[PDB]
Design a binder for these strands. Structure first.
Length: 1078
RNA sequence: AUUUUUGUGCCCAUCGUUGGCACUAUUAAGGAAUGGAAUAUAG
DNA sequence: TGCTATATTCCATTCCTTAATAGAACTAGAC
DNA sequence: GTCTAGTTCTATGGCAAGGCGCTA
């Protein structure tokens, strides 16, 4: 029901005097230095846990007792860390020696887990526990007693309480509530309710609870039974009855009884520690005197990875077990026959070192079609040996063999256009053994080998200490606050300064490390974004109300661009170039205050202060909870479709619609509202450039840059192509260079492709690497049109940074290639050319920031659109595509490289977070299957309706590639891709509609095909033919779903020619649409 | 408690007219891929 | 018109997932 | 009277394809 996230604001610390920053420095170093003591100590505690302690415990999520013991007795940690190493073969033996019993299957899978043998090892935490006992001189009896209470207090085990809590109950010396009194009270309430099981009013319940505590009021009840702490839910009933807010609430007595009965265990004992005094004295010797807030904040940072890895490794072991059980070990014998390939004459290789076989080695299941073809050739060669061939069968057999070989080579080449190329020799070998293993067992055997290697490599998570950070705030932490805006105003008035300024002060209680006592101290921060959105005061009387969503942002309805006074403008203009952007925002903010345009922000004690000290830098973060209540009564669905090269798209669908444009969709009345592209327009003068699609200036305007490129490449003309049986053909790069140097080609295309040419050049002049240095600098770093200075967020721009990366890589690789002492490292590269190494790093950092910006700007458009729709219609459900498992070893690495820049996941995760801050927005991801081929609002209403995608182009620009593609669609050969059939319908409808036959496309000269199309189009007075093409820009939709669609007669039916992606966004919106209103 | 010069970043043949924008921080591991040099193979 | 293919080693990278942190409500006692 | 510094709180579809571009 309730929803929570945080919004953080980064800030810059504005230091005070050396000596005051030294004091905070010292405190932060004290907390950091103490944290590993708590880590080591809790790891010792875990190692003491045992059957007796965990007996009859919840044990949730199907984790067995062995697993729970194992995860606490044994952990994979860095080799050089303090606990003692243990060998993997020993784990079961030690477990039995500590348990009394052999480890079950869960603990068994834990111990078999893969890990990096050179970084980490298993560690024996039980030995760590023994060392606690010996060093602190605790009895096993005493420690075990404390350990058991700690277990029931959730200080250890699988579901820990908060550090603040654990610290308090273990270490605090405040007055405790008497637990026996609460046991008596809880037991009595149970009794009285068992004696009256059929009450139905809270009134009745309240009176029974009071009777149980022998009291007239809530106040007396609390004082006697639950003096200190948050109010237990059973006393809450009474409180709320006196307040009169729970009168017409239901009473479910069996629950009440059950809940009370559950809490009883924790009140059977008083929490009288036997060992805590010694453990505190040890702690005081290492981290200094006990204080709740400091010990708590140190413990926080130690517990996080200890409990985190327990949760994660437990889940991981369980998954491993499921995954081993999906492995069909009954297929091992088939594996071995396939794996026999390596012992065969078809693969023989020096050192005879073999590798793991995978489905893509035989081309997935397509081997079945290859076997069908090979078997047809064989059967037909058999009768050709009986009747056709008589005595001279020495030439017919040789013919069979060549035909077998050819059918295979053809198969691998076919497969290898859209995937990794299957291994000729492995398929030759496998066909030699047709009699030993059936084709569906070749697949199952290969699958067995691949899946078994995959599951058995999965790595356990090692337990690594945290780099800590410490939290200050209002409640249950180290004490701190942001000076409230009103207190800011008061403070400045008292010191006789300006009402307002641009800095943010915190007051935090900190330990003076010299006195080891607490002192409150003020520190200064700066963050313009915090100023704008939160802190800067609306002082003007009668300001606009605080906004529904709290922060003062454009997305929340505050443009924050007021008309500046003359002096304000001149402050901007006179500010140093490095400070002008910040001052402009300050000015715009200050104007908005003066002109009563700045809305209120409702201050609370809602911001946590997080401090991370790295060297002498302090990183201070301010973060606040943002609360939301879901609103499932949706009025609009906003589909979103993610693309790589083209633009992302959205589509809005009104649900429960009425009036004009309504469509009946399986009894639900719906209406298309709109569809669109996601663009991020940035204005330079009167022009505007779409960050997401701009591919750079035409080379028209770049001739000096390109001439300067040309001038260089001429000096390194020479290359020599692949030795195709010792040919050594000449290679001029200028033929390639001139292909890209047109006035119509874009800067980013030119730069990218030039990187690839320079790369190749370098490979042909490996001893002359150093000479490319300066022109690499010019291209990437220094030039006015270099990669670092000009680049959009377009796909091509990201491919630019990638190829630049690769070029630098080529450079270093050839520069440091030995004439022919270990491999070349980043240490080595940086020393050989710091500037170039630094350039690799600046390219890396520039790319990350571009990626981050993209995610943020795309997400903003989606959320802005959704908010806009919410304001007109009511609640919006945003639906994106569930994208996973994109990059696979079975695909060509060029395909994987192309898919890597997709960012659908990163964009979607950002929408997720942003949505959590707005009433009336929800985000789900849906199955994207057939999303690009469905006829929206016709598909599933009621018939399945799928159609191909279409390219549109003039006859001049038809390529061989297009003609070939259209012919592949008219091919009779079946496929297991269900979309194939759509393209085949498309190609058939293509012929009919332009009055062609297969014979007019098939075989005839490309040029003649262009002519044939030209004659047909000209007679029809059309500029452009549509043809079916995978990935095509256009879709022939029934409804007009692209505001700019034109109509067409296609095979005697009328469709709108829509952008294929605007169509996809509506389909994404429609996926299981009926479920979002059931 | 006063620093008054900065929260992080994004775009451009014109880097400014107030140029135009956007944004949850951190810690750690794991998962799947990618680039470069070279080796071994079959083409 | 051509973007050779598989597999491995070593040095490097990016995109994403999943374990965590960024406590609430309270009161006795100190101002 | 406000606030600090301590305590205790917590609640009852099987697969596998599909979803992604080239420039020129």
């Amino acid at each position: 029901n309730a929803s929570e996230t945080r919004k953080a604001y980064t800030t810059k610390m504005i230091p005070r005097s050396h000596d005051r920053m030294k004091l905070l420095g010292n405190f932060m170093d004290y907390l950091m230095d103490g944290t590993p003591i708590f880590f080591e100590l809790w790891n010792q505690f875990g190692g003491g846990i045992d059957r007796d302690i965990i007996s009859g415990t919840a044990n949730k999520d199907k984790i067995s007792d062995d697993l729970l013991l194992a995860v606490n007795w044994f952990k994979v940690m860095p080799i050089n860390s303090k606990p003692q190493g243990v060998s993997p073969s020993n784990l079961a033996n030690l477990f039995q020696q500590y348990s009394g019993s052999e480890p079950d299957i869960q603990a068994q899978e834990y111990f078999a887990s893969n890990f990096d043998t050179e970084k980490h090892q298993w560690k024996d935490m039980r030995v760590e526990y023994e060392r606690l006992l010996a060093e602190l001189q605790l009895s096993r009896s005493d420690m075990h007693h404390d350990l058991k209470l700690m277990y029931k207090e959730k200080c250890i085990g699988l579901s820990l309480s908060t550090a603040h809590y654990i610290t308090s109950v273990m270490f605090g010396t405040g007055a405790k509530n008497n637990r026996q009194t609460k046991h008596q009270f809880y037991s009595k309430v149970i009794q009285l309710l068992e004696e009256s099981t059929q009450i139905n009013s809270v009134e009745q319940l309240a009176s029974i609870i009071l009777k149980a505590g022998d009291c007239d009021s809530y106040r007396k009840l609390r004082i006697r039974c639950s003096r200190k702490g948050a109010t237990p839910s059973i006393l809450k009933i009474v409180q709320d009855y006196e307040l009169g807010t729970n009168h017409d609430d239901e009473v479910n007595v069996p629950s009440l009884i059950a809940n009370l009965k559950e809490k009883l265990g924790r009140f059977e004992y008083e929490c009288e520690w036997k060992c805590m005094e010694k453990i505190k004295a040890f702690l005081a010797s290492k981290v200094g005197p006990y204080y709740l807030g400091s010990y708590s904040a140190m413990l926080e940072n130690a517990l996080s990875p200890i409990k985190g890895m327990t949760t994660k490794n437990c889940k991981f072991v369980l998954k491993q077990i499921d995954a081993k059980n999906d492995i069909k070990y009954e297929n091992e014998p088939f594996g071995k026959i396939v794996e026999g390939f390596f012992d065969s004459p078809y693969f023989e290789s020096d050192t005879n070192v073999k590798w793991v076989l995978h489905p893509h080695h035989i081309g997935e299941s397509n081997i079945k079609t290859l076997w069908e073809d090979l078997n047809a050739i064989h059967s037909k060669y058999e009768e050709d040996i009986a009747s056709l061939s008589e005595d001279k069968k020495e030439k017919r057999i040789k013919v069979y063999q060549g035909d077998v070989c050819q059918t295979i080579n053809t198969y691998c080449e076919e497969v290898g256009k859209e995937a990794k190329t299957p291994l000729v020799q492995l398929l030759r070998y496998l066909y030699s053994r047709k009699d030993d293993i059936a084709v569906d067992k070749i697949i199952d055997g290969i699958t067995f080998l691949s899946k078994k290697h995959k599951v058995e490599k999965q790595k356990i998570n090692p337990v690594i200490q945290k780099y800590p950070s410490f939290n200050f705030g209002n409640n249950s932490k180290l004490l701190g606050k942001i000076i409230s805006p009103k207190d800011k105003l008061k403070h400045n008035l008292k010191c006789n300064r300006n009402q307002v300024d641009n800095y943010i002060w915190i007051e935090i209680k900190v330990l003076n490390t010299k006195t080891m006592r607490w002192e409150k101290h003020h520190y200064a921060l700066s963050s313009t974004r915090f100023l704008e959105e939160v802190y800067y005061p609306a002082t003007s009387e009668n300001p606009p109300d605080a906004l529904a969503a709290r922060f003062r942002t454009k997305t929340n309805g505050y443009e924050g661009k007021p008309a500046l006074s003359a002096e304000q403008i001149e402050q901007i203009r006179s500010a140093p170039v490095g400070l002008r952007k910040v001052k402009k925002r300050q000015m715009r903010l200050e104007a908005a205050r003066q002109q009563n345009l700045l809305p209120r922000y409702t201050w609370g004690k809602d911001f946590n202060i997080n401090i991370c000290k790295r060297g002498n830098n302090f990183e201070v973060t301010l973060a606040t909870k943002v609360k939301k209540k879901k609103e499932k009564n949706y009025k609009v669905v906003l589909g979103y479709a993610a693309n790589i090269v083209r633009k992302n798209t959205y589509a809005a669908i009104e649900a429960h619609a009425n009036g004009d444009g309504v469509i009946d969709y399986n009894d639900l009345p719906v209406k298309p509202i709109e569809s669109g592209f996601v663009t991020v327009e940035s204005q330079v003068r009167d022009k505007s450039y779409d960050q997401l699609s701009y591919n750079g200036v035409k080379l028209l305007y770049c001739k000096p840059h390109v001439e300067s490129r040309r001038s260089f490449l001429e000096k390194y003309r020479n290359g020599t192509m692949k030795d195709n049986r010792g040919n050594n053909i000449q290679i001029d790069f200028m033929k390639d260079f001139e292909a890209i140097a047109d006035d119509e080609t874009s800067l980013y295309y030119f730069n990218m492709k030039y990187c690839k040419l320079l790369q190749s050049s370098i490979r042909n002049h490996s001893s002359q690497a150093k000479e490319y240095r300066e022109e690499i600098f010019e291209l990437l770093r220094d030039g006015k049109l270099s990669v670092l200075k000009l680049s959009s967020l377009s796909n091509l721009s990201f491919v630019m940074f990638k190829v630049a990366k690769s070029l630098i890589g080529t450079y270093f690789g050839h520069l440091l290639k030995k004439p022919k002492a270990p491999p070349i490292t980043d240490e080595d590269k940086q020393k050989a050319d710091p500037e170039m190494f630094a350039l690799r790093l600046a390219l890396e950092e520039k790319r990350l920031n571009k990626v981050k910006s993209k995610k943020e700007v795309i997400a903003n458009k989606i959320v802005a659109k959704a908010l806009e729709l919410r304001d007109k219609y009511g609640p919006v459900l945003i639906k994106g595509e569930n994208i996973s498992d994109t990059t696979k070893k079975g695909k060509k690495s060029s395909t994987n490289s192309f898919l890597m820049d997709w960012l659908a996941r990163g964009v979607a995760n950002k929408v997720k977070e942003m949505v959590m801050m707005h009433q009336g927005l929800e985000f789900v991801e849906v199955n994207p299957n057939f999303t690009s081929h469905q006829d929206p609002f016709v598909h599933k209403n009621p018939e399945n309706t799928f159609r191909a995608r279409y390219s549109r182009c003039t006859p001049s620009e038809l390529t061989e590639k297009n003609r070939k593609e259209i012919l592949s669609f008219l091919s009779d050969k079946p496929s297991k891709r269900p979309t194939n059939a759509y393209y085949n319908e498309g190609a058939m409808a293509f012929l009919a509609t332009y009055g062609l036959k297969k014979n007019d496309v098939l075989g005839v000269s490309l040029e003649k095909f262009k002519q044939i199309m030209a004659n047909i189009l000209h007679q029809r007075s059309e500029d452009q033919l549509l043809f079916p093409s995978r990935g095509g820009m256009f879709y022939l939709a029934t409804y007009k779903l692209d505001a700019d669609a034109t109509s067409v007669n296609w095979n005697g039916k009328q469709f709108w020619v829509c952008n294929a992606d605007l169509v996809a966004a509506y389909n994404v919106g429609l996926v299981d649409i009926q479920k979002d209103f059931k």
